[PDB]
mmCIF file of C-alpha atoms in Angstrom:
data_model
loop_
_atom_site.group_PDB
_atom_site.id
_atom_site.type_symbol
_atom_site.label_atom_id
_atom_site.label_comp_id
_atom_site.label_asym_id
_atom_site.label_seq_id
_atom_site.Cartn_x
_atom_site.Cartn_y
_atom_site.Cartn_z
ATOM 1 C CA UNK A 1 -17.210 -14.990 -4.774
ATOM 2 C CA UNK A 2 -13.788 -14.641 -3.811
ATOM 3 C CA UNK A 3 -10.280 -14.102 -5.089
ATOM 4 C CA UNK A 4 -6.868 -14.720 -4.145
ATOM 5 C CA UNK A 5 -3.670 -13.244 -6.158
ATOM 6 C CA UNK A 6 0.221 -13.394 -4.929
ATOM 7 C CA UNK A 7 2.129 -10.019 -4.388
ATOM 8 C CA UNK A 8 5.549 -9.845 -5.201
ATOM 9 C CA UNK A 9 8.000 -7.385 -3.791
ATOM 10 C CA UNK A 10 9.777 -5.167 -6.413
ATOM 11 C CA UNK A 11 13.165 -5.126 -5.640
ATOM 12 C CA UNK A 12 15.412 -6.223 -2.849
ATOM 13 C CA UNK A 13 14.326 -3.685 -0.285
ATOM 14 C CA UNK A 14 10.460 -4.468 -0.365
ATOM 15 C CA UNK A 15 10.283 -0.548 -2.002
ATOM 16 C CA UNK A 16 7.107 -1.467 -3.092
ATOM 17 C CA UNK A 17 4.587 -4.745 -3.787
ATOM 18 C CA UNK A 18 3.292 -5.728 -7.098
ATOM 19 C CA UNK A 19 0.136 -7.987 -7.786
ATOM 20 C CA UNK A 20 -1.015 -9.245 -11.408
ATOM 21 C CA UNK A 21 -4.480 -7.729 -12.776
ATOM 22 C CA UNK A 22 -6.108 -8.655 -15.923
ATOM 23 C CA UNK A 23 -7.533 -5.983 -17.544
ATOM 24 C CA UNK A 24 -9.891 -6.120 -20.755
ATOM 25 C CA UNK A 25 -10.852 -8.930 -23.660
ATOM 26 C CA UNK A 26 -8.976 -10.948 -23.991
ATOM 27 C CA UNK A 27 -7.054 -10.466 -21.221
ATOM 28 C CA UNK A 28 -4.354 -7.664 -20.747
ATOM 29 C CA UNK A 29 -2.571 -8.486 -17.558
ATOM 30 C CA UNK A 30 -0.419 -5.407 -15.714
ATOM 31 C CA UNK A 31 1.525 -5.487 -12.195
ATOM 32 C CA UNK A 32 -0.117 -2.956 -10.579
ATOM 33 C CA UNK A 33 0.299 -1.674 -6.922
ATOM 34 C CA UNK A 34 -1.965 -2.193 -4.555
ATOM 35 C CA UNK A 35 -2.625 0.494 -2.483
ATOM 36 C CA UNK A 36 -5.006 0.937 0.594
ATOM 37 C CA UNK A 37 -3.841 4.784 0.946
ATOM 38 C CA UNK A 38 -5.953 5.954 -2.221
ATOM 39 C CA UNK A 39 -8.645 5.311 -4.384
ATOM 40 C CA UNK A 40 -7.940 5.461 -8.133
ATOM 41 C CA UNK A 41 -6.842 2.416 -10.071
ATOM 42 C CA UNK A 42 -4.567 3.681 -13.110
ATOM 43 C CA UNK A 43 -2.457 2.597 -15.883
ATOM 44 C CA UNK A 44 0.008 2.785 -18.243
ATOM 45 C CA UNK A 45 -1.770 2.733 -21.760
ATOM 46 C CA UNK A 46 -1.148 3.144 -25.228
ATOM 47 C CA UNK A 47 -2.280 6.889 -24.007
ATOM 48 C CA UNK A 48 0.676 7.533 -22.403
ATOM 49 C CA UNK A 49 3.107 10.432 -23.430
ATOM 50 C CA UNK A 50 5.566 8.024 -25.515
ATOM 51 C CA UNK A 51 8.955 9.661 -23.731
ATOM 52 C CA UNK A 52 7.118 8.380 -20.090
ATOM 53 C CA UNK A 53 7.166 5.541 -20.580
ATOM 54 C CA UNK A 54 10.422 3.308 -19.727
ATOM 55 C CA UNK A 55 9.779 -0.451 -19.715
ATOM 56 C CA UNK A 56 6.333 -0.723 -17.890
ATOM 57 C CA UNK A 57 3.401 -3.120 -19.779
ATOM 58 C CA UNK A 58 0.965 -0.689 -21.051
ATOM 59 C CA UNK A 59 -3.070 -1.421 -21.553
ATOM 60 C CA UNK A 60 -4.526 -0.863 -25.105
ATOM 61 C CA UNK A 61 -8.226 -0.091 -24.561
ATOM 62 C CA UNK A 62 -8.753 -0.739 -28.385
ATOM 63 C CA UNK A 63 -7.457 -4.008 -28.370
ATOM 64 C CA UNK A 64 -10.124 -5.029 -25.875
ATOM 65 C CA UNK A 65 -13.788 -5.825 -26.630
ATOM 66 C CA UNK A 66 -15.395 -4.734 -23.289
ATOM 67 C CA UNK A 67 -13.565 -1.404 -23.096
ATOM 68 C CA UNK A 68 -16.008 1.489 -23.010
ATOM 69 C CA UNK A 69 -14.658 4.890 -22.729
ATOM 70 C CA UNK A 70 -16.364 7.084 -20.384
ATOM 71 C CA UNK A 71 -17.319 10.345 -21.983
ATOM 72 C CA UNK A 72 -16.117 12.924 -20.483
ATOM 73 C CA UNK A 73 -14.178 11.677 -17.456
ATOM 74 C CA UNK A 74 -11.027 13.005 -16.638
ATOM 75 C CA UNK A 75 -8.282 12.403 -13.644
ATOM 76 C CA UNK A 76 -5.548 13.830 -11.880
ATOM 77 C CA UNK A 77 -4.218 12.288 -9.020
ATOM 78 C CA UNK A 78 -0.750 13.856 -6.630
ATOM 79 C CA UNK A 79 0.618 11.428 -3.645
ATOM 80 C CA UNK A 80 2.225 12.047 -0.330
ATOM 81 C CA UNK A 81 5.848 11.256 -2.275
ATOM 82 C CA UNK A 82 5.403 14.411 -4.479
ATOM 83 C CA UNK A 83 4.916 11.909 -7.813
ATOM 84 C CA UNK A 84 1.257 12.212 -9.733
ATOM 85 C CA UNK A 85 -0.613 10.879 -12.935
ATOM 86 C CA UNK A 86 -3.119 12.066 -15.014
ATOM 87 C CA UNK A 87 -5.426 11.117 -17.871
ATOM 88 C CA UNK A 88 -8.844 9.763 -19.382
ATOM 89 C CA UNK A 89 -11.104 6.907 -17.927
ATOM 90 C CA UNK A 90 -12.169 3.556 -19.586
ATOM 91 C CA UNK A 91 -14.701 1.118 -18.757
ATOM 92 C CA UNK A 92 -13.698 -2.614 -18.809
ATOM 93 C CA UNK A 93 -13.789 -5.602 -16.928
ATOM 94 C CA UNK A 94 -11.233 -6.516 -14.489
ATOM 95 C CA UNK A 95 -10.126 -9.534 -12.171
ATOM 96 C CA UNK A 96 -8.189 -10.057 -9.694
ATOM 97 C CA UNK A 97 -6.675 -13.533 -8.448
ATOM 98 C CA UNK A 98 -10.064 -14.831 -10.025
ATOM 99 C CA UNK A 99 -11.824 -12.194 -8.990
ATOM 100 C CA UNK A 100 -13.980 -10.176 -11.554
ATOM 101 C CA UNK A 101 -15.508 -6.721 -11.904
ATOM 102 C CA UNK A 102 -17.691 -5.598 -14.849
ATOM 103 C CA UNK A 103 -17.582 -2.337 -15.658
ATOM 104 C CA UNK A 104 -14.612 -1.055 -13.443
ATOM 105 C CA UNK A 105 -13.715 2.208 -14.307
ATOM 106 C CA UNK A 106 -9.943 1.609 -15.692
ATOM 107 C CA UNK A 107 -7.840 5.357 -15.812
ATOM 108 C CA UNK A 108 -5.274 5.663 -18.431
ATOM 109 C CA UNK A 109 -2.583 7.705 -18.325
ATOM 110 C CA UNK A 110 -2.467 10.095 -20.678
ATOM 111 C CA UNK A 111 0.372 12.155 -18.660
ATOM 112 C CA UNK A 112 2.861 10.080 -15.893
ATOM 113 C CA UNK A 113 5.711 11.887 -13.226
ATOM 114 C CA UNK A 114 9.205 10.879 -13.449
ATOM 115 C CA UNK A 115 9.272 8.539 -10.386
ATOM 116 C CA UNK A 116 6.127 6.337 -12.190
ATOM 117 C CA UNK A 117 8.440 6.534 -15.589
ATOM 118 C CA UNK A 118 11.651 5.167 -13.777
ATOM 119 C CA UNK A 119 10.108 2.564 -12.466
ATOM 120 C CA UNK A 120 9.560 0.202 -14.821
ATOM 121 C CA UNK A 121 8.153 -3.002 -12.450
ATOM 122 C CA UNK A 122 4.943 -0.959 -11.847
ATOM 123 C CA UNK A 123 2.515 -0.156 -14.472
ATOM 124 C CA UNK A 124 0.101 0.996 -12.648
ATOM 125 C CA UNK A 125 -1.711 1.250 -9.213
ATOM 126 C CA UNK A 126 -4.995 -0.221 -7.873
ATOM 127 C CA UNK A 127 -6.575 1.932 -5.196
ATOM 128 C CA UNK A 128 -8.213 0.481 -2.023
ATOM 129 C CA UNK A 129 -9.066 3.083 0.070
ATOM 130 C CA UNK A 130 -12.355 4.758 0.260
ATOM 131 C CA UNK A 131 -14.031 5.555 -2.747
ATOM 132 C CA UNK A 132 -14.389 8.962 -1.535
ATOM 133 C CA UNK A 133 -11.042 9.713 -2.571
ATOM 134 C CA UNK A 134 -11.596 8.835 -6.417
ATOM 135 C CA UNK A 135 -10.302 11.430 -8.477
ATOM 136 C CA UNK A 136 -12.572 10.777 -11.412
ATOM 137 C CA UNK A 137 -14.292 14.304 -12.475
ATOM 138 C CA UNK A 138 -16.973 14.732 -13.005
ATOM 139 C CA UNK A 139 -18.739 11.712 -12.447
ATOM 140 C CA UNK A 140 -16.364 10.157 -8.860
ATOM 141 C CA UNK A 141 -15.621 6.463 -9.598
ATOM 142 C CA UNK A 142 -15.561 3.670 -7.225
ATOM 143 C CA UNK A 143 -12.786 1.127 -6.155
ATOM 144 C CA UNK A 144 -12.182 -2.091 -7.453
ATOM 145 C CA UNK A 145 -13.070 -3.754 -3.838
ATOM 146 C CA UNK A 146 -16.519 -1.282 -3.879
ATOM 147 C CA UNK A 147 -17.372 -2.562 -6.966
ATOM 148 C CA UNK A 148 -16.857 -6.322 -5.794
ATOM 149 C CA UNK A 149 -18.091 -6.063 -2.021
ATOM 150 C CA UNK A 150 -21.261 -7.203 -2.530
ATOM 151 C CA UNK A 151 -20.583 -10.200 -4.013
ATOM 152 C CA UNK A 152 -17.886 -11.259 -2.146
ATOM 153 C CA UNK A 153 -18.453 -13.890 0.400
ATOM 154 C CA UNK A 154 -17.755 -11.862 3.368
ATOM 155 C CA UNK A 155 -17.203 -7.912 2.471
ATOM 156 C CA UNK A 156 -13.350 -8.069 2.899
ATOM 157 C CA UNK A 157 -9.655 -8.134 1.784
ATOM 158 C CA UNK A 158 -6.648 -9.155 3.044
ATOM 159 C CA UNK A 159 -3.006 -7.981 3.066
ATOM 160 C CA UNK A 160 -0.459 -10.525 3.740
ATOM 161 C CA UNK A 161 2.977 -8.478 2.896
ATOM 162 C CA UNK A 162 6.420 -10.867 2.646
ATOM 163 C CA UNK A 163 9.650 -9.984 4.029
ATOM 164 C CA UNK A 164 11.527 -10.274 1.089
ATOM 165 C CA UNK A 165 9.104 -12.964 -0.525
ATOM 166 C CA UNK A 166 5.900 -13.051 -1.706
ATOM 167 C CA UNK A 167 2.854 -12.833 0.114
ATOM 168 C CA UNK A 168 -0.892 -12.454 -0.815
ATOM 169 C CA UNK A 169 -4.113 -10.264 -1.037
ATOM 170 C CA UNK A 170 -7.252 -12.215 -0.686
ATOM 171 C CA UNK A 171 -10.674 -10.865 -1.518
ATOM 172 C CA UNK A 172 -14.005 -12.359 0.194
ATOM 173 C CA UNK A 173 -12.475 -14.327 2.643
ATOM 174 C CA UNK A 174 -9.999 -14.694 5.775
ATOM 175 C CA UNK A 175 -7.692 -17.564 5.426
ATOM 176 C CA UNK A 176 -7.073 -19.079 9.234
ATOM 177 C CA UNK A 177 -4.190 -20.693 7.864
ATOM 178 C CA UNK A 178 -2.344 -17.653 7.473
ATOM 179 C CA UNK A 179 -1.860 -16.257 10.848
ATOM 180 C CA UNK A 180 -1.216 -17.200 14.308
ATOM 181 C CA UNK A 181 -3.005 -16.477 17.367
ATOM 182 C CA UNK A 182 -5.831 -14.542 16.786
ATOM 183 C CA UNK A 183 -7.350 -11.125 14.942
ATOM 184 C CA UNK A 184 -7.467 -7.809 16.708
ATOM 185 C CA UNK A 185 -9.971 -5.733 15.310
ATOM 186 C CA UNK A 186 -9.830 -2.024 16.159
ATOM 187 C CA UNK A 187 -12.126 0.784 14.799
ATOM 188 C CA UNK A 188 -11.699 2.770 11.567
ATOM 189 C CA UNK A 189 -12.545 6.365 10.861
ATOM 190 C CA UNK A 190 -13.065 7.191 7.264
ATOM 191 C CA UNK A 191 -13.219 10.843 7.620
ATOM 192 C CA UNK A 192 -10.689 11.353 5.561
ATOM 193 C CA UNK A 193 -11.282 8.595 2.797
ATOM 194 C CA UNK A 194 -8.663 6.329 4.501
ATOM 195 C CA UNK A 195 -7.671 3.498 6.683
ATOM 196 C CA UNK A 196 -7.506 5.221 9.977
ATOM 197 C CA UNK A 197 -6.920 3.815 13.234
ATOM 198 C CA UNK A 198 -5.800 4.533 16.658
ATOM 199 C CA UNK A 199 -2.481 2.513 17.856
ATOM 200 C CA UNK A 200 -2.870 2.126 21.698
ATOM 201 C CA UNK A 201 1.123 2.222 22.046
ATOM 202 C CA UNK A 202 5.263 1.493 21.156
ATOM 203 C CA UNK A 203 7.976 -0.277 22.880
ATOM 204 C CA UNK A 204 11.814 -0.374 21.069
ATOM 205 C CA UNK A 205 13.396 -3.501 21.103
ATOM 206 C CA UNK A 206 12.943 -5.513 24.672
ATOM 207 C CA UNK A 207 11.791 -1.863 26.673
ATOM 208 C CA UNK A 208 8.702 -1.418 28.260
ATOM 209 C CA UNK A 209 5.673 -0.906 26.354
ATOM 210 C CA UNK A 210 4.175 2.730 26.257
ATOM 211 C CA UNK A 211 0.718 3.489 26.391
ATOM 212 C CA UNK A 212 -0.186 6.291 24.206
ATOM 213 C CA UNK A 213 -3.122 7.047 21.259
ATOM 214 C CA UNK A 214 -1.105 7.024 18.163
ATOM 215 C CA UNK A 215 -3.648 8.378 14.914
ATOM 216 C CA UNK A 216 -2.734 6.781 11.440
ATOM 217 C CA UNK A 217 -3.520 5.259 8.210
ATOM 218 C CA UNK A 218 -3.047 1.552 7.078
ATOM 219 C CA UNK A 219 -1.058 2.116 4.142
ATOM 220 C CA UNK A 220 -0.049 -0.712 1.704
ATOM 221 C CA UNK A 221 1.333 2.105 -0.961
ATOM 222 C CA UNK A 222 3.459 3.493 1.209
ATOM 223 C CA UNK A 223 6.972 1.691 2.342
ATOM 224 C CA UNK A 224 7.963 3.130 5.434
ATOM 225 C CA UNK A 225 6.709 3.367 9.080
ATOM 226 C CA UNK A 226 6.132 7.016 9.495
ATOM 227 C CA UNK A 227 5.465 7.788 13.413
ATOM 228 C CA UNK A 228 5.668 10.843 15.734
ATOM 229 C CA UNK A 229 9.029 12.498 15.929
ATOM 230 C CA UNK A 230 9.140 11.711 19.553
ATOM 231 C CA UNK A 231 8.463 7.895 19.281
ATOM 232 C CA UNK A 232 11.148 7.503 16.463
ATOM 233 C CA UNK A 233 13.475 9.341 18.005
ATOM 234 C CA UNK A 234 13.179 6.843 20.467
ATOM 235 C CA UNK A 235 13.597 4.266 18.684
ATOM 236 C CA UNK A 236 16.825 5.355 16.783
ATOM 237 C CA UNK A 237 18.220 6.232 20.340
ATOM 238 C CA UNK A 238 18.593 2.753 20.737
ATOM 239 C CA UNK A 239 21.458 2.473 17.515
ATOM 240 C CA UNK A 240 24.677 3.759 18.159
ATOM 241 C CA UNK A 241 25.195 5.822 15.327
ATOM 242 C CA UNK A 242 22.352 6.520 14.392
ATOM 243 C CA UNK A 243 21.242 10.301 13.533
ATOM 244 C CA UNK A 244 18.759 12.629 11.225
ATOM 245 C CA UNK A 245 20.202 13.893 8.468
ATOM 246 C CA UNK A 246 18.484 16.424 6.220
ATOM 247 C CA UNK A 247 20.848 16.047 3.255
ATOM 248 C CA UNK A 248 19.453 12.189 3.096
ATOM 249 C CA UNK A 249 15.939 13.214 4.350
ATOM 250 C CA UNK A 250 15.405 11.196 7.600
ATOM 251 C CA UNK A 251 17.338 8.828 9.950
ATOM 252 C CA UNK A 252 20.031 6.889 8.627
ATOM 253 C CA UNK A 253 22.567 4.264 10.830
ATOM 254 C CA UNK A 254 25.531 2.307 10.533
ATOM 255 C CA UNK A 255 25.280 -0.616 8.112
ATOM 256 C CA UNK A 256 27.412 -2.317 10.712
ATOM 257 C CA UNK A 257 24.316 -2.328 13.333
ATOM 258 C CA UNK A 258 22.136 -4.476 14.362
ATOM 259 C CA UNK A 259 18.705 -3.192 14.789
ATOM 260 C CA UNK A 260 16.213 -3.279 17.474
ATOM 261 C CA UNK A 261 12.678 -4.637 17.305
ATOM 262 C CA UNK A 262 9.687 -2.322 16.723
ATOM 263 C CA UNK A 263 6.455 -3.248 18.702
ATOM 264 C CA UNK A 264 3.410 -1.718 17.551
ATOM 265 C CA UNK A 265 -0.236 -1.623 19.328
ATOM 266 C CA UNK A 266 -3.092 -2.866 18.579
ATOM 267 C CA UNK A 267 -5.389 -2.988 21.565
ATOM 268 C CA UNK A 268 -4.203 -5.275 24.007
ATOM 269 C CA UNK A 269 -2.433 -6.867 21.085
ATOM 270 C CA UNK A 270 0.666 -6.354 19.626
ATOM 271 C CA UNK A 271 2.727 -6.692 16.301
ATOM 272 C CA UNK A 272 6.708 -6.940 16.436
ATOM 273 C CA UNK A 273 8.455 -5.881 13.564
ATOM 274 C CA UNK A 274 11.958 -7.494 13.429
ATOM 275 C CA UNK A 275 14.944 -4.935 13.232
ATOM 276 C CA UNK A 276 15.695 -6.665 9.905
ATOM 277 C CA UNK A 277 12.604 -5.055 8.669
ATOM 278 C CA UNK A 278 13.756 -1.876 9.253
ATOM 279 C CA UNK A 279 17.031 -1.809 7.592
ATOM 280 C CA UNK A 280 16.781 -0.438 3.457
ATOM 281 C CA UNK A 281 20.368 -0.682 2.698
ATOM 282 C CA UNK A 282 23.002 1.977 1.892
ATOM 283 C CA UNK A 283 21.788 5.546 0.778
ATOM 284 C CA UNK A 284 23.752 5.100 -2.336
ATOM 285 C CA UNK A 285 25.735 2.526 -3.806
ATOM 286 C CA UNK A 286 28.736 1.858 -1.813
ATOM 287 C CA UNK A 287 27.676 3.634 1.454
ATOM 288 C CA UNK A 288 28.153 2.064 4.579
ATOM 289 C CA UNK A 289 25.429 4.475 5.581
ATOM 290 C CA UNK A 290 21.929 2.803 5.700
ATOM 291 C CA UNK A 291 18.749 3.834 5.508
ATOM 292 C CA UNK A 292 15.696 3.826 7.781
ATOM 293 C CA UNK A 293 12.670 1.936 7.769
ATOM 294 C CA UNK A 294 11.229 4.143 10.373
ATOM 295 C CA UNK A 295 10.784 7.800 9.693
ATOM 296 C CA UNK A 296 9.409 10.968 11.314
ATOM 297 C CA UNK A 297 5.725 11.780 9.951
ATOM 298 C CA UNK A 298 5.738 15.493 11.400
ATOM 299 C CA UNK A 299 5.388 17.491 8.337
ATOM 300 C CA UNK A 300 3.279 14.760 6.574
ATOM 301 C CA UNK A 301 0.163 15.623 8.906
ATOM 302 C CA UNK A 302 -0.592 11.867 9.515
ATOM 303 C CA UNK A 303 1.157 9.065 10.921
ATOM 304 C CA UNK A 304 1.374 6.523 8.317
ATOM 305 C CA UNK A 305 1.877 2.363 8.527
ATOM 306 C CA UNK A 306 2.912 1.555 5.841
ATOM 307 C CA UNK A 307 4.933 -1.745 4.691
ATOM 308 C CA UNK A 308 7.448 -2.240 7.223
ATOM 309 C CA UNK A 309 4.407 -2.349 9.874
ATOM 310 C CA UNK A 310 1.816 -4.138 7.598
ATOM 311 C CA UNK A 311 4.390 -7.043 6.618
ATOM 312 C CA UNK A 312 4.681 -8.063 9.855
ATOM 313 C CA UNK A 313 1.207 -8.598 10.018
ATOM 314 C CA UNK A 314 -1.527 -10.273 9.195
ATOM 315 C CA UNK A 315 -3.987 -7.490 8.006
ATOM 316 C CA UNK A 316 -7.801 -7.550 7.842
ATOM 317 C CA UNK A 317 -9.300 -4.858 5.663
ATOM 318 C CA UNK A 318 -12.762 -4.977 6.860
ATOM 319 C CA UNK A 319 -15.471 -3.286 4.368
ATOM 320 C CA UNK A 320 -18.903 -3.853 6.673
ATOM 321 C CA UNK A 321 -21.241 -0.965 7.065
ATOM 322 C CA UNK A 322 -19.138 -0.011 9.801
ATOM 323 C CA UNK A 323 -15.866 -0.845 8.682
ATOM 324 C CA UNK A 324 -12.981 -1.862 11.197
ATOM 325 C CA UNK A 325 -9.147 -3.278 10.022
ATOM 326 C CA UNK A 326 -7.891 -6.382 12.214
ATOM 327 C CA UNK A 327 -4.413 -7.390 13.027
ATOM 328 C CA UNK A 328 -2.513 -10.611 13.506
ATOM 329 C CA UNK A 329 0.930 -12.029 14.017
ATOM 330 C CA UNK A 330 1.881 -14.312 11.692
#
């Protein structure tokens, strides 16, 4: 089997990417957010704390005939951003771009943080990291893409991020069309549950390329490029104007710039990210002070690539016994 479902950026700063899920019978279909930095796939539901929710399509497990609630289960789930979730755990069937899982455990939220409530595009996320992560209790719960791997034609998904458009996830299946050149396949440690690679190196704009290991995670959930303190300040070294600013929380730069290039490694190969990528608009309305796309990870603990490194790729998420992620341009 395979499937094949568009992703749609939220807003007009690709803040976040949201893909269509059917959930239940008949059909209940929710805009969740994919995200290959954790392991839970949650909802809005007719569970949720009424004053939480703001504008976001809620599942009803009782209006569906496959639901299944599982006794007992239970979870609570906090991300890098500070925002969590919380809540009770269905059974139900669920498909994705034609894709479908029987008996996916489905976890409504029974409690949601501000940041989930104010955003009312996404009503929910769908975790595809490792299923070691699952925050099901007491009985851990496996991902949507566990539950489908063996079935799938080839044990694999996808991520083809837009630049303010759509792109696509595809499940089972690599789709030549949508790349150029060729895939770069580097190795994956799941020690920690995630994504995790090794970047072989950096250049800014047209500079020289440096060689050096850099550790981190493949992170569709997360927006920003988050890199080593000394490698970004490189990079915003290269925009006059630019500087760190606690009171905004990172780097922020003229709106009048133009930004450089960002080249990422990936073995021998290696991904450019356009400076238009990296620009996320004024800090507040009216500002001619702009945000970042790149960001300083010290005091995260990991390096994280998150959209504005993955959208200018080609990404192959690949779920063999020994897993590895490839990258191409595109």
């Amino acid at each position: 089997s395979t499937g094949s479902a568009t992703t749609t950026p939220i807003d007009s700063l690709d803040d976040a990417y949201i893909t269509p899920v059917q959930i239940g019978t008949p059909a209940q279909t929710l805009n969740l957010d994919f995200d290959t930095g954790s392991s839970d796939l949650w909802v809005f539901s007719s569970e949720t704390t009424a004053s939480e929710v703001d504008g976001q399509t809620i599942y009803t497990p009782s209006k569906s005939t496959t639901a299944k609630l599982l006794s007992g289960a239970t979870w609570s789930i906090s991300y890098g951003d500070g925002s969590s979730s919380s809540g009770d755990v269905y059974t139900d069937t669920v498909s994705v771009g034609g894709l479908t899982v029987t008996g996916q455990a489905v976890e409504s939220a029974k409690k949601v943080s501000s940041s989930f409530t104010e955003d009312s595009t996404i009503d929910g996320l769908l975790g595809l990291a490792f299923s070691t992560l699952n925050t099901v209790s007491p009985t851990q719960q496996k991902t949507f893409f566990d539950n489908a791997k063996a079935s799938l034609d080839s044990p694999v998904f996808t991520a083809d991020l837009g630049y303010h458009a759509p792109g696509t996830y595809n499940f089972g299946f690599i789709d030549t069309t949508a790349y150029t050149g060729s895939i770069t396949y580097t190795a994956v440690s799941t020690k920690q549950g995630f994504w995790e690679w090794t970047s072989t190196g950096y250049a800014v704009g047209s500079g020289t390329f440096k060689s050096t290991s850099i550790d981190g995670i493949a992170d569709t959930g997360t927006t920003l490029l988050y890199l080593p303190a000394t490698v970004v300040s490189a990079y915003w070294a290269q925009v006059s104007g630019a500087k760190s600013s606690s009171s905004v929380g990172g780097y922020v730069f003229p709106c009048s710039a133009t930004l450089p290039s960002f080249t990422f490694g990936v073995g021998s190969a290696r991904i450019v990210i356009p400076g238009d990528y990296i620009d996320f608009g004024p800090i507040s309305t009216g500002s001619s002070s702009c945000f970042g796309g790149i960001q300083s990870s010290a005091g995260i603990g990991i390096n994280i690539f998150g959209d504005v490194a993955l959208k200018a790729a080609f990404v192959v998420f690949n779920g063999a016994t020994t897993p590895t992620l490839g990258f191409a341009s595109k």
